[PDB]
């Protein structure tokens, strides 16, 4: 009777903490293993791969786009994806945005992250990048829904990422429910056969 939850919890066991040192000054900001830039690129590609899973249901193909919660559709049909990567609009190149010299970096994904976790609905991070914080589904991503293992409200210290793909409930529509469940089986098969030594992944699909 409520939305269906497909979910991943991702950790980076072989990755160390690192230190963001802001420019021109500012105090050091620690960043947990899974907010390493290379880990975030890997996770974005896993997320996109999930977005492009297709299941076979009799003579139809079922995509996530067919079954996902797209509350702003038909005008914005982007699937709702609650993920830290949506602060970068699920874009490798936004994630790599940086303002810097040959010696110094004035703004980068650290800056954007630190701003967005406090202003998730903002269209402009007020920094030299001027990047939006809104996810590509047109809505905000609250930091406590997509990060775990941090202390207080220091989301930069997160030790796990939470990625959620809401799917329609299809209450009183068993036919479409069949397609959603076929896609969920394919989701499970994919993730259970995805082994990346730099990542641990807990994964669940709706019962």
Residue numbers in the entry: 401 to 607
Authors' description from the paper:
Niemann–Pick C1 protein (NPC1) is a membrane protein that primarily resides in late endosomes and lysosomes, and plays an important role in cholesterol homeostasis in the cell. NPC1 is a 13-pass transmembrane glycoprotein that resides primarily in late endosomes and lysosomes. The second luminal domain of NPC1 (NPC1-C) serves as the intracellular receptor for Ebola and Marburg viruses. The viral glycoprotein (GP) interacts with domain C of NPC1 (termed NPC1-C here), which is one of three large luminal loops of the protein.
The goal was to co-crystallize NPC1-C in complex with primed A82V Ebola virus glycoprotein (GP) as part of an effort to explore the basis of the enhanced infectivity of the A82V variant in the 2013–2016 Ebola outbreak in West Africa. Human NPC1-C (residues 371–621) was expressed as a C-terminally polyhistidine-tagged fusion protein in E. coli as insoluble inclusion bodies. After denaturation with urea and a nickel-affinity chromatography step, the protein was refolded at pH 8 using the glutathione redox system to facilitate correct disulfide-bond formation. Although the objective was to obtain a crystal of a protein complex of NPC1-C with the primed and glycosylated form of A82V EBOV GP, the proteins did not co-crystallize regardless of the glycosylation state of NPC1-C, with nonglycosylated NPC1-C crystallizing alone. The two disulfide bonds that were expected in the structure, i.e. Cys468–Cys479 and Cys516–Cys533, are clearly resolved in the electron density, indicating that the refolding protocol was effective. In full-length NPC1, domains C and I fold into similar structures, intertwine with each other through an extensive interface and form a tunnel that may function as a path for cholesterol transfer. It is likely that the absence of domain I allowed NPC1-C to crystallize as dimers using the same domain I packing interface. The overall structure of NPC1-C is similar to other published structures of NPC1, as expected, with root-mean-square deviations on all common Cα atoms for each aligned pair ranging from 0.36 to 0.78 Å. NPC1-C uses these loops to engage with its binding partners, explaining the different configurations.
